[PDB]
Amino acid sequence: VKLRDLDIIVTAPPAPGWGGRYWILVKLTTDDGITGWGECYAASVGPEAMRAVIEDVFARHMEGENPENIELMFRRVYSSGFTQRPDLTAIGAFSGLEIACWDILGKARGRPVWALLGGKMNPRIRAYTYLYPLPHHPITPFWTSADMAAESAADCVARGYTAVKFDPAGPYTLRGGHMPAMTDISLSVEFCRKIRAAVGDKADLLFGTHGQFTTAGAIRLGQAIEPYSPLWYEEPVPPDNVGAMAQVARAVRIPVATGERLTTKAEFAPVLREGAAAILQPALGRAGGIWEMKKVAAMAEVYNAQMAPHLYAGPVEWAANVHFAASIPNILMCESIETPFHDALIKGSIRVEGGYITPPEAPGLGIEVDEALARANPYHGTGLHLEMQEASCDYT
Amino acid sequence: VKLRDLDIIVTAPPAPGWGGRYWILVKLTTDDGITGWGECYAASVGPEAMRAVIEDVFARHMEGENPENIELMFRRVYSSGFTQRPDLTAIGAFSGLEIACWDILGKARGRPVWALLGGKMNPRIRAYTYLYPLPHHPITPFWTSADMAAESAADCVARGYTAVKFDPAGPYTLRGGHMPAMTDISLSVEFCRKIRAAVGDKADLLFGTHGQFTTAGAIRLGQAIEPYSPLWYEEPVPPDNVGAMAQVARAVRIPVATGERLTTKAEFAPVLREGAAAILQPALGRAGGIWEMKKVAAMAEVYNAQMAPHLYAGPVEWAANVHFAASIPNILMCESIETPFHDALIKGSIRVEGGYITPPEAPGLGIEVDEALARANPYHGTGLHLEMQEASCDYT
Amino acid sequence: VKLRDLDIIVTAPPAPGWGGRYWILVKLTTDDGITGWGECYAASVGPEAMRAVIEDVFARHMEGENPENIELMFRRVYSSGFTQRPDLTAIGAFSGLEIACWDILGKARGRPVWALLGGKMNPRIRAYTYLYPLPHHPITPFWTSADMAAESAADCVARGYTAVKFDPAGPYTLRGGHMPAMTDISLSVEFCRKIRAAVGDKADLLFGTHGQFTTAGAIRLGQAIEPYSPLWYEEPVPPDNVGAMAQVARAVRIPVATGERLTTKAEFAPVLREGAAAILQPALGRAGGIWEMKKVAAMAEVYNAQMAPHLYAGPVEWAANVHFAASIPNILMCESIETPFHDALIKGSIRVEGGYITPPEAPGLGIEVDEALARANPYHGTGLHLEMQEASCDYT
Amino acid sequence: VKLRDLDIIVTAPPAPGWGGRYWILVKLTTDDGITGWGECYAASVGPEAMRAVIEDVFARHMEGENPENIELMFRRVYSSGFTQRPDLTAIGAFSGLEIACWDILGKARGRPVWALLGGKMNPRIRAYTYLYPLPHHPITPFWTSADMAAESAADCVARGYTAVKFDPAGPYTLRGGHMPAMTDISLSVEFCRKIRAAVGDKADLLFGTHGQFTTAGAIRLGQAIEPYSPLWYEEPVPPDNVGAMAQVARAVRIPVATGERLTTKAEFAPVLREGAAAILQPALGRAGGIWEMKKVAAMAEVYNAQMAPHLYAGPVEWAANVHFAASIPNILMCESIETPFHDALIKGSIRVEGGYITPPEAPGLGIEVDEALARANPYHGTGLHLEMQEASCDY
Amino acid sequence: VKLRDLDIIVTAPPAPGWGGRYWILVKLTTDDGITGWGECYAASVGPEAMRAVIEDVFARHMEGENPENIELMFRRVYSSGFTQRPDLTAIGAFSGLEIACWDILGKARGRPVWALLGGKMNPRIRAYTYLYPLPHHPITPFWTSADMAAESAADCVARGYTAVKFDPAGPYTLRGGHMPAMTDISLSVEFCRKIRAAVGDKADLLFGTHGQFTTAGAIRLGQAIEPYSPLWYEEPVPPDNVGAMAQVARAVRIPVATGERLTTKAEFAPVLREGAAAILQPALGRAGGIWEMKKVAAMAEVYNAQMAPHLYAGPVEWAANVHFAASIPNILMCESIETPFHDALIKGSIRVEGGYITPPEAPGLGIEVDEALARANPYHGTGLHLEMQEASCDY
Ligand SMILES: OC[C@H]1O[C@@H](O)[C@H](O)[C@@H]1O
Ligand SMILES: OC[C@H]1O[C@@H](O)[C@H](O)[C@@H]1O
Ligand SMILES: OC[C@H]1O[C@@H](O)[C@H](O)[C@@H]1O
Ligand SMILES: OC[C@H]1O[C@@H](O)[C@H](O)[C@@H]1O
Ligand SMILES: OC[C@H]1O[C@@H](O)[C@H](O)[C@@H]1O
Ligand SMILES: OC[C@H]1O[C@@H](O)[C@H](O)[C@@H]1O
């Protein structure tokens, strides 16, 4: 078969909007009518600019191609316009389209995507979630309340989650790395202490930092939270300096996790080689798609390192994560977001049950995308999927 | 003053089209009506998608801002959408806009841009050019003809050039690095031998490769051309592997030059640190603009390394290169392209004279852009500025 | 479907016998009657012991399993008996069985194997061959005759080959590395000189050493042959010391190729990481099979390195090489052996044509194995596929 | 003399089966009637296939050879079939045969094997044991019971042992390294705390992990057990990544020990060179035999590192360990397993006495193998000596 | 048996005295009357002081000991007086005594020494020699004559030698490394050119420098001789800086050989680890003896490096080299000196024949030492075995 048609749907999750301001869905159709769904993860520019980028990438490198030719299509986009180094925006476009190709391939083969990726390694995939406000928690105060976070952790654990994520360490800003305030450090310690007291040995603590810090700052914060045995320390520094992250990794006793803002094996390889991270967290809708991330997973294997696929986006990218995770021996866990809208968008096709995800057995990604629901929920705002503060860190 | 309006003009150089399929010009206007001109260098996606990207970057991060705030505007774009690592496409958009800001600043200050960048280091800037066919040379056979290249080289020296560039080493393809054919090596040797014979000591040879090669291939080719004392070996490998390039630099006795496909100090710093290149060749319309490249020039200084700004684009980016070059102690030379169209587009405001460029004394970039000429030459081709071949290297 | 039956056929090539004393072929049959062919490359012990080893591996880890589960089956064999490090014999057994699984998968999917491996990268694959005696050459004197080798090189070029391999450097012995005799060095120079004269730019020289040498000896030999621009220097030292090989790589101006005696990504990753080789030459019937070697090919990509699959065995392993090579962007060339028996054994299903190989379009490996022919050619000797002599290097 | 005959006996230890499902014994006879016994440690494939491998290795490289020629026979097998890099299965076959050659050599020389290896360094060799259930302990609950492990440790100390080993860190699986569960870490801390309280300064704690973990996971577990001063941290990661293990060694304050799944000096040298381990634990029946391990012991010397020969097998390999250990300056301790079957199989010829082993003075390995007993205890299972679980870690 | 008696004999080789001013022979006798011969290589102080050192070492650490206990006796001497780091003089004394122990052990075992060292690897051992004046060559002009050296080289080849050594690079002085004169480089080039022309492919050139040079000077000299493909570049810098030798190794395309002035595995291990030398040339009478060098040979194996035992001493140390070399898979070649005195002192027991040495089959070192001849040739001078001049390099 040959790829023929592209539809792009930008959809806005209802309030409180866990998973960001909008999700960029792509729907591909072959010349014989098979449809595949994918999801792009790219917000350097807004959704309208992303539409033009996606349409270009598809028309230029993919339209009329056999969807089997995943290596070739990656090379075309990766090399586009005499580049042949990672383009964060163009590869974001490609990744979503590549995921749709896998959905198509599974349907054409009559097999789930994982069955095409070296088969099943994992009959059940360990899941985790951020700590989100419970219904009685005021949303804004929740983010700096250790007490409320501990309640959310207790509820996650009751529900079967074996790991929970939180970031009490303060705002990320556009200036780059900063030194944490003493209050950021003490709050981070309070969170770890209270969450550990609430979950005991029943769950791991995932310290979900957002690249806020200088190397110096990341080390000072890291050392303070060591006594609570967090399973990982995520993005301790901004994503533009592998050497700086390896410095943090060598100086703190907590495993460093990173990858959500990185793209292609050309960026993941140095992270491993320099010892910057032990746990890789690519967003498949950003990092080059399923096949490219299989290449990265194999690289992680020879460093005795593991994958933990990123999710702060919709259930389509999450379905890609699940098939990917089902097929690799070095899976740690899959980030997950439980909301009515996430579930409804794929008609409950794949779910976290008792803290774990069972790989679907249906063909392709094993999802039924509610296209009507996505279209009934357009994005009207002027913001990006996520945004970085302009105001500096508060020391007063 | 504040940045107010943006106009984007995509212009096609007339046949034979030295400088690529199209140039992306940007024109900014302040709220007091000062106009500034810049040029973007970004072709992962085509002109129409780039229009949308540039509009987004301007409206989101720059509209309404004081043009003095160059550090701030860079931080905004660089961090946009929770990224804060180089985005080749978004920073390409910013870079052109940043150059227009400098044009505006120079006009507001009543000074040439170089005077705002630490003043004048270089009363004259050494230029170079590719070897282009002479009026009596057939175009297609020229590129693989050592005899014709040598004739072109003699002509360049007659007109005062002290350095000439050529790439006789074969096609660059989307597959990534390949091993050169024996004929690629022999042709490269023949070019270097005959061009050296033609120029003697009057000019340097610049071996202007396009990242065609595996590390192994780059070393085999490099050792073969060493006897002709080429001043530099440009992009010996693809731009997505700093360690690989450093392996070439250590294994060949020719200084390695690179950078036209890199962006921001976050990418240039590791190139220096690992010893991947001795000469840095940013395209200012790609790499973050003038101020960001001043940062890189300072970094090159503490490696006893030099800048050689890239030009395979229009005279507006070139003008930016000139002001940048004029203000740095560690300038090697400025890539230049002499066509009637280049000259006409800036109304002969800045020219190579006897192999050298005098920094302009007029305010701003010191150019008068022929906007009418640009608009009379629209681009409506289907191709990208430059493109990478799909067919493999030919060994037969 | 499920794997059900295994047949093992050990076949001896007739005269002149290029490709070793015997080939170990495996035939797998599923519960629904689909057949797949593979080939094991393992001769630490003889074919009778290997038959017992292959039976054990299949029954313990593979019988009853869905052939899709390539990741899982590799993990089972690789970890077998609380090992989980490379076992050369056990993995040799698995590799052939794994290749047969791929033949089955392609047949089940109705697609060529390469189509299941990320699709087609290479519509034509560059082949090479050893220099073999011409009909007018006495066989034994051929191996040390530079004059005859040159004739054979010209012959290969006339056949359309673009690279030729030869080893004039003397015997490999069980003692480990030795220093070459002055005669070994002079003969190697004479070979390179006369072969280069005979082929000019029409073909590459592949210096096909067999790990005879101490690090010191390999460097002395390497420097002597540099003037002839050999494309690679194969196994300059024994395969049991990555650091020693990297020392050679750094001290010689020729790219180092290795891998035929290595197994799994666990061994190939340090080779890349330490810069021991630029070109990886796994024997797929030894190194863990097709999928494991796709993992290695991906690792080679992030070192800007290439694959050149090894062949000193039958056409079944070669078929695996072809499908593997068809699917990777970083293919250099495929080692090939053109004998009447190789061709007859797969009924001319896949052939070298004018120095290149077209990937087959038929399902699975795209071969029709002549089982009757393999069975009519049993192995009756007491030797191993290849053997290392006991007598030392001859300096007198 | 010349090696002429090989006999292979696969024997199964009676329940509870401390030492694994089966032991592969080899018996070599020279042309003038001297017999030597050795033991192979190799289970990538089962005993049936191993018989075929052993027969091949012996017939091809050793039959008809003078047993003095240990360097040559090693080179022959190591290089077999144009290989000349470690083959886990072929070298496991060779190792047992090589041990048997040393038994023969000792007998022909009229000297204990240690006497031929540079002489006696160690009049008494420090022994250690795993913690095994006491008679009143239920077998299954014992492995996760810190209380019972502490009781067993106290008993070990009362019998003279100065070091004890235990692994409470959870299952090893075929998937490769995993992250420990919080309960794996807490249980490991509980074991270390209670065993340390039970033994005080009277014994060392040996944290006998089985390569279960990712580098990250091994560092998290390792840091938690540091306060109890464990003497070593064994196989913290799988045996297929020297760089990963070196990362653990640099990041935890406990000496790393490894080697039971490694083979030949070609694999032990990089471990030392990269600082992956401070203590080397080859299984002599796997790693290339006695002489190859003397080479490794010498390499360990120039890294100020020590040897601790592995034992999860029979008394024959153990006897090889003792002679090896007696002859080296850099011995730490010898792993030992005390069962009635181990003792009976070598007719009580060598024994742990009060936590230490005296090198025997009799010729060869100084053992009398009860061949009849070995033959009366055949292996009837379908499994391997040890096996790796398919199911993942339980969180 | 136990070591009981020590006799020291210092003997001077007659003019022209190839092999140095004197050789230090040691003779050990066991309590049951077995005799063993060894040779010490130690010249920091003269023969009389060395006598006192050897007597002390023997009486303190070895007398009354079973000669089997080679590991233990080395540890004793190595650690003597709270040292436990290489003492050139003390270990030089031990080394000769250790060689004598091996002679005794072989006699007691009824086997050649090589048979006790892992058996035979090499049925014949490749030999080499310095280029010595031919009978019609004037001795003094010979050392700086490329023409005469080439004649001697052609003669060596006619006699079956496959490698020849020479040093045209100038004097070694007590000052330490110096820069070669242009004439030193030119003469070295002339030597290499003319010797290569005389031997073609029939022999290797061994550039046998004596540590004359600074790192810079060694690199300038090394690059100039590269075109003639010398097999090795011996001791390019003084033996007291591993990092400096490694700098030469990385900067010249010739393999570096060293070790004659080094002692124990503690010094050879860093040489390998840092990549300072690819070929190791211990003098067994200096470096710790046969067993200690077997440890070093095993270390060389895991660096894919080789041994070339040093000889500028008597036939007793040479006998030790031969047995050592016979037993190791990684032998390159054995330095040899053919003089009437060498041959007579061991009664022609072991000889170079057609450029190769056959390991003896007789018990022990397989030599019959002419004790009477040794005593008939005492050393009468006041000098040292070799000496370093005080005058600087001549520019
Ligand atoms: O600048 C170096 C690059 O490496 C990666 O860590 C980041 O993507 C960054 O862009
Ligand atoms: O691939 C690693 C990064 O380094 C740079 O060389 C490339 O642009 C890439 O983004
Ligand atoms: O794969 C690398 C090797 O290092 C050693 O630790 C293992 O034996 C493995 O085979
Ligand atoms: O000896 C260590 C390993 O490195 C690799 O080069 C060989 O396969 C060997 O097994
Ligand atoms: O000079 C430092 C040490 O290194 C060795 O090379 C020398 O023997 C010396 O003792
Ligand atoms: O072992 C190498 C040398 O360095 C010093 O530490 C020792 O004394 C020894 O002589």
Ligand SMILES: [Mg+2]
């Ligand atoms: Mg995150």
Ligand SMILES: [Mg+2]
């Ligand atoms: Mg260029």
Ligand SMILES: [Mg+2]
């Ligand atoms: Mg080969």
Ligand SMILES: [Mg+2]
């Ligand atoms: Mg263990």
Ligand SMILES: [Mg+2]
């Ligand atoms: Mg010397």
